[PDB]
Amino acid sequence: AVLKTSSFQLPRHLVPGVWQKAQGQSVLARLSNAEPQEFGEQQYMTLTAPP
Amino acid sequence: RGEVVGESAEKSESTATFAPVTSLVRKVQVTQRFSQEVKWADESRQLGVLQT
Secondary structure (H helix, E strand, O other): OOOOHHHOOOOOOOOOOOOOOOOOOOOHHHHOOOOOOOOOOOOOOOOOOOO | OOOOOOOOOOOOOOOOOOOOOOOOOOOOOOOOOOOHHHHHHHHHHOOOOOOO
16 A cells, blocks of 8 residues: 555654753752861860850 | 823713702782772871871
C-alpha cells in the first residue's frame, strides 16, 4: 500500500541544553559570615551565669 | 711457583688458577602512608612531620 514514514523509523531530533528543577542554596552561608579558621577544632569561651 | 733443576733434570708444569665472582642485585623501597588530614595539620601548624 502507500508509503508511510513509519517504514523509515526516523531518528528523533535532540534539542540542546538540560531542563532542571531548582535547588535551594545554603541559608547558614547567607545568615552567618564565615570566619577564617585553621585546620582542627576551635574552642570558644562563654559566660554561664553573672554575679 | 718457580722450580730448581739440574743440567738435564725434567722441568715441571705449574700454572696460575683463576675464579670468577658475581654480584647480586638488591632492590630496596620505603613507603609511608598518612591521612589527607596530616598534610593539612602539618602545613597549617607548621609541624614539620612531613619533612621529618
